[PDB]
Amino acid sequence: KAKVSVDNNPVPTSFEKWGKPGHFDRTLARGPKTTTWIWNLHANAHDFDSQTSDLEDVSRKIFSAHFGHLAVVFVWLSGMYFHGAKFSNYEGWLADPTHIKPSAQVVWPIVGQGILNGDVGGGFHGIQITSGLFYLWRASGFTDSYQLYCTAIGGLVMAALMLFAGWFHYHVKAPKLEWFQNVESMMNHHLAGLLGLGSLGWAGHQIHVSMPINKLLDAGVAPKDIPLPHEFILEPSKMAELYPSFAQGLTPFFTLNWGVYSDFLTFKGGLNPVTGGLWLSDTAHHHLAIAVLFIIAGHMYRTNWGIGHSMKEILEAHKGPFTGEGHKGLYEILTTSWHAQLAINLALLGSLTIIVAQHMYAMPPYPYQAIDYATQLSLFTHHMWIGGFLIVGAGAHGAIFMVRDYDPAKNVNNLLDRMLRHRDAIISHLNWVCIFLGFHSFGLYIHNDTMRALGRPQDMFSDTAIQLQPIFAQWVQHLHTLAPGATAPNALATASYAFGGETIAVAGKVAMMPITLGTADFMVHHIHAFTIHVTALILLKGVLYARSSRLVPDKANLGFRFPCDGPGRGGTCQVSGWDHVFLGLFWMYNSLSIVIFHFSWKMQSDVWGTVSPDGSVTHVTLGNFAQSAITINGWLRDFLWAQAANVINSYGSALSAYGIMFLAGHFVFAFSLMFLFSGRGYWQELIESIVWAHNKLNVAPAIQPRALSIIQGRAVGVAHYLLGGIVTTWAFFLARSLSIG
Amino acid sequence: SHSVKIYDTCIGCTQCVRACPLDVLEMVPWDGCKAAQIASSPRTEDCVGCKRCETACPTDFLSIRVYLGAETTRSMGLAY
Amino acid sequence: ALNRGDKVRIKRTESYWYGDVGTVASVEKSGILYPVIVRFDRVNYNGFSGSASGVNTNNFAENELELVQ
Amino acid sequence: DFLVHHAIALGLHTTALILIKGALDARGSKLMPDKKDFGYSFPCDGPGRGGTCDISAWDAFYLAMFWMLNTLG
Amino acid sequence: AALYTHHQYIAGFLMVGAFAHGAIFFVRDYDPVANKDNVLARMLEHKEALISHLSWVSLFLGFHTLGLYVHND
Amino acid sequence: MDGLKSFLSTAPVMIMALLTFTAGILIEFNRFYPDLLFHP
Amino acid sequence: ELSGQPPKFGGSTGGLLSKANREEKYAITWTSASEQVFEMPTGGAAIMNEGENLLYLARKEQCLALGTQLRTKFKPKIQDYKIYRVYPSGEVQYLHPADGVFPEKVNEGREAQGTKTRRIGQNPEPVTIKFSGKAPYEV
Amino acid sequence: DDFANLTPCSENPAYLAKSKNFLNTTNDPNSGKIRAERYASALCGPEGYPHLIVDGRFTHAGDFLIPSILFLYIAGWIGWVGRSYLIEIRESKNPEMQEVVINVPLAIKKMLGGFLWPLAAVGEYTSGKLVMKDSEIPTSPR
Ligand code: CLA
Ligand code: CLA
Ligand code: CLA
Ligand code: CLA
Ligand SMILES: CCCCCCCCCCCCCCCC(=O)OC[C@H](COP(=O)(O)OC[C@@H](O)CO)OC(=O)CCCCCCCCCCCCCCC
């Protein structure tokens, strides 16, 4: 009695196809003749759409591969827990969190890398970790290493479970296509049974486990004396003496007398003075409310009892005068093409990751996270880079869909057709706005640079000169500062002190203080706007013009990934959507680099620092952002050269592994230029000569070596370029943040 | 405009003719190959130089070559 | 002269297999400029960018090939 | 000074390699047996025959200029 | 310092130009029949050996020089 | 099984196995005899 | 003259420009057996009328791409499409197919053009024809 | 009396001053002392670090010669076994497939025979099948 419909044993389990690489592709099946057959093999592997024309088989492969990635992630998580249980000082750090550096990686002394095992405090030697696992574990009610070990074992078991699930759900019982297309039931289950249920379970964990342990920990109780979490459940009087409302049981819940639970379900806001993190009661009510909302939302779409809206009806009913058919036809697009779903989900997930990175730093949830500047910087930059990559992937796979799965017959005068019919106006207006933003933002920096260089500081765009005050941002900051008073009366303090208010400081360091905005903030925010609009321009031009263009009228027949159309028409290099993605990757890199640089410098200059017992705050870089970040020379001198001392002078210490890596970052970048600046004809001729050489000695290979294809050359260049640049920035940031106390 | 030249190694496989997107090439009877047909380029003033004809030729090196010369509006593929 | 199951060396001076050794697949009647058909183990560069392989056969005249066997 | 002189030797030999290879292959090669008919500086031979980006002798000079600059640096 | 850098950069540019215009000569003004079997035509006879051994010496320098530098670092 | 034997003998598995063996040899030798700048 | 009803299209910004009214344009005509939808080479989809259809484009490549789409993307194959060049003076020059037979197949009566009687390896050296206005392939 | 600008590390004040604080490379605490005693044999500059001399003299044969033969033997071993395996593969009716899927029995059999690579190389060179004739090798057009 279900919509379940599966096929039994569609693909037998055998090992023969393991010994025949390239089995999936007919082009690579017959065997290698040149070295290109190798590079194709690793490139067309996980492209199930090209291998077969069956939507059902493609969907089954996707389901199984998703199980595999889940198993891999589970293995990674279990490994993190194991290495934090056995090779970490978490038990030592828990007793003295304000004097001992977190550390979970220990190095074998073999060729002198034992110097990397620097002292992290408390007599423990190891690599300091900035992933923030210790703060998460403390907020999760971890006190003993055995609990972490048990978590790691459970993670390994669950990874094995996911692997077996993939094997069963593909090689044995594979769901039918109609099962995959129950989008209404799928959203119902994932909105209610996954997000709502998961958030409710976490709220239960936090209330019944995390609150008592953290309440004891912040009150000065030793970690070795705090009762085990199950003791609170087995002895409810222990829970009741910590929170009096627990003495009333569950009666106030079912009677809607919810105010009884006000003692441990609060709306405090702000941060915990003891630890610098958010209140756990705030997070408990938050995750409980989130669970309630998602469980309510999960019942919207009708599945099997005719109660609920139908997605197709909603899509077909929203249509206005300017759009003709409106949103009609999108439901068939999104229920028959995986690439459109991948594009939308990638864009939303990348934006969500950027939101996560932007919202964590301003209000640190985990205890002592704000006091650890290195952890803040690392987490912010990491999740920002992840989000940027995901957005670029959305821009790529959308163009893939447009090239492959777009059908003009079923998209007559709908929203997609009117996308393709006024795209030229879109691209022209977007190009104009990109140029205008670039001029009226970067020319401000250049004008300031020239005015400073000419000895005319009074003609600059500075707070002591012509001022560009972000009045709207300051006004919204003032509004959010006044929110606890009347606009949100039941809130004790502000959502985050970044908007304004008091300076929350833990131990001798600043946890969070108001972040004022001046001329420099205005200029940098508009620079961010310019870079983002340019990246959007590149990716949107790639998606819109993927099918064809004025230059090439049958581009879609060439495919998504082709190098060029030849030197005709004056030259047609990089006209495919793939080349648009390749070009947009660089611009995403530039934008995210500027974003992380701005965050790091502003946090170091106007937020982080130390608090004297008198109450005065001494920032890390003495507040030089407002006067130096208005010129490019300021960025060069007071940020790069100034803050690169801690990484260049890292030799002979525990931080030397960063300095090495720093230089490593400066290398691969340069190396990548030897793929991006050149072409494959020269390398092919050089390979011809080298092949003659190896032929003279009768040692020529049977597999004829060939230079990399144009697309592969571009991919290798961009990959090594991004690797080098990102590694450079990572080493620089880590070595700087681990040395500013 | 560009110059499209066809040499005597052509085998009348018609691949160059089919690959031409601007209809520059054609087939004319011949007697030097089994197919008794050879490629011809009577409308070179429309050729753009995309080299698809060269890409499609199966013979060793090429029986068809495109030399890019004076650029006109048609050759440069301009729609404005 | 050249016939089935042969082993010849190319002297086209612009072919990919110049100086290489190929086998005479077949020959046809007169009236053809390049009647000899020779196939090679190694493939040439023919094909679009990223192609898996190339072409391992061609047509040659009788004066462009020398007997090896 | 030993290490840097040997590095300079590497740079000189590599730049000479690029320039000499371009000069010798300017007449023609396996990829383009008739390069001389196409002039000294031409863009490419299209994406066919595996792709022929940067195949002219002018492009060999263009590549060698970067190595010259690096060696001088 | 300025004089040394200036005249060394000029020398590098001139040395690049010599090979560039020599490649131009090979493309345009080289007559194989007139120079048949002399040194100029015989250079193209063992050009593959030239490029092969030059690649070997460049690789041999680069590998074991970058290796020593990275080892010391 | 035959398929497993053939898969294990593919190029990446062989090259990584040889690299692991060589790396282990070097690391062990440097563990027992480090700082070998020359033959004494 | 040219006769045909334009296909049902909502228009787009990727259509003609000043070149059509200043330099030249192109036209394509074809008889569709039944009304259906085809992809505009300039972007979007257009419904083509049953019977004779006439369409104006800016480049010959766009017209030939549309013709290839007509020939290869419909079960009733459209083989009667004709492509003309339209001059601003009103003169119409018939372009494709040249003689009513597709160039992919050999037809008696065509004259060989651009055909050389030598291999590509027999071209003369540049030094033998330098200071002339010719090229090695041109001689 | 050569290397007047170089001094033995035994009586170099800088090397002696800096040699008491040598870091322990491995878990063995005596590694610093062993390195300090072993580096006293070489020649140190004013910076206190040992230097190598490769002029060809046999007194310093440990600096370059012994490692030179040590590396050359291994490199010849690898090259010879690879070349012989390739040549043997070339006659199996599918050399490319045996190039990606390694013939492990034959591979190891050729591995175990590489210690005689100099004798095999000289025998091949004398037999004339080590080097191919220029007329039998494909070459690009001149
Ligand atoms: C309550 C029901 C429920 C839940 C929780 C999920 C959860 C999930 N589905 Mg899903 N699904 C459902 C019903 C549900 N589905 C139904 C009814 C259909 C048919 C219409 C589908 C069809 C479907 C497809 C086609 C796909 C998914 C996928 C996924 C995963 C996406 C990855 C993710 O969110 O990472 C978060 C990951 C986790 C939270 C790890 C969870 C590990 C296990 C599986 C959870 C089991 C919990 C279970 C309730 C018991 C625990 C309770 C108690 C013992 C503690 C996620 C685990 C994707 C996938 O391949 O993943 C396998 C995918 O492509 N779903
Ligand atoms: C959930 C995420 C997700 C999923 C499921 C897919 C799924 C797919 N993508 Mg997609 N993509 C994504 C994210 C995703 N993508 C993102 C974020 C980007 C932006 C970078 C892209 C960009 C992209 C392009 C440009 C292309 C695809 C293609 C494909 C298809 C398979 C071919 C392929 O890439 O396999 C083969 C995979 C590889 C060869 C990757 C191996 C090499 C990687 C790059 C090395 C990475 C190095 C690592 C980060 C660091 C190592 C350091 C080292 C020192 C150890 C398939 C539909 C291809 C396609 O058209 O198929 C239809 C294609 O051309 N994707
Ligand atoms: C004695 C010196 C000399 C002479 C007489 C020539 C003569 C010639 N060369 Mg030659 N060349 C030389 C030195 C020389 N070269 C050097 C040193 C190099 C190495 C860089 C080259 C590299 C070279 C190449 C690669 C090519 C030639 C070509 C040519 C021929 C025609 C094209 C030309 O040069 O004009 C045209 C010249 C130009 C358009 C150059 C303009 C570029 C300007 C000068 C750059 C200025 C930069 C900018 C202003 C900086 C501003 C700074 C500010 C911001 C402060 C001609 C026979 C071409 C050929 O084959 O024709 C037969 C050709 O392709 N030469
Ligand atoms: C720092 C950047 C960089 C580096 C390392 C190289 C390196 C090389 N180039 Mg190149 N090149 C560069 C920039 C660079 N180039 C740029 C910007 C240009 C301008 C476009 C050129 C233009 C150019 C031309 C035109 C030519 C070269 C040639 C060469 C090779 C000559 C050998 C040599 O010098 O040392 C030896 C090589 C090295 C020291 C590099 C190897 C270093 C790695 C780290 C060794 C270890 C491998 C590593 C562990 C693999 C790990 C993979 C795994 C992690 C995924 C070599 C591969 C020439 C060539 O092919 O010679 C045969 C040649 O013709 N290059
Ligand atoms: C707030 C901060 C300062 C921002 C000030 C900038 C305002 C500038 C433009 C005004 C916004 C107008 C939106 C009305 C648009 C709107 O109301 O659409 C309504 C109309 C669709 O109306 P229907 O009722 O037909 O819609 C049926 C729907 O159900 C969908 O089918 O859409 C169009 O006409 C599309 C044409 C938009 C083409 C212009 C796009 C402008 C792009 C640039 C946007 C710039 C602002 C970006 C910053 C977010």
Ligand SMILES: CC1=C(/C=C/C(C)=C/C=C/C(C)=C\C=C\C=C(C)\C=C\C=C(C)\C=C\C2=C[C@H](C)[C@H](O)CC2(C)C)C(C)(C)C[C@@H](O)C1
């Ligand atoms: C046999 C073999 C092969 C082939 C090998 C071949 C074909 C080799 C060919 C070699 C040729 C043609 C030429 C070689 C020339 C070598 C020279 C010129 C050596 C010079 C040595 C010098 C200058 C020694 C210098 C000083 C010597 C001295 C001992 C001290 O240190 C000081 C110091 C460094 C100055 C392969 C490649 C096929 C496979 C290999 O495994 C084995």
Ligand SMILES: CC1=C(/C=C/C(C)=C/C=C/C(C)=C/C=C/C=C(C)/C=C/C=C(C)/C=C/C2=C(C)CCCC2(C)C)C(C)(C)CCC1
């Ligand atoms: C030590 C000494 C001595 C000796 C010296 C010597 C011996 C020197 C030599 C030197 C040399 C020996 C040099 C050389 C150089 C060279 C070069 C620099 C080259 C270049 C080249 C080029 C540039 C090329 C080009 C070309 C071509 C490619 C083709 C055509 C032609 C031409 C030419 C144009 C003495 C006794 C005096 C005294 C004592 C000390």
Ligand SMILES: CC1=C(C/C=C(\C)CCC[C@H](C)CCC[C@H](C)CCCC(C)C)C(=O)c2ccccc2C1=O
């Ligand atoms: C150098 C270069 C080449 C030549 C480079 C080649 C042929 C690649 C050679 C790769 C070697 C064989 C392996 C190195 C990379 C492997 C991933 C290393 C794996 C190592 C593990 C097995 C340990 C091109 O073909 C090319 C094409 C288009 C634009 C630029 C270029 C370009 O710059």
Ligand code: SF4
């Ligand atoms: S340079 Fe390369 S990418 Fe550009 S047209 Fe020529 S072959 Fe195509």
Ligand code: SF4
């Ligand atoms: S592709 Fe080449 S061989 Fe075939 S018909 Fe055209 S010119 Fe002749």
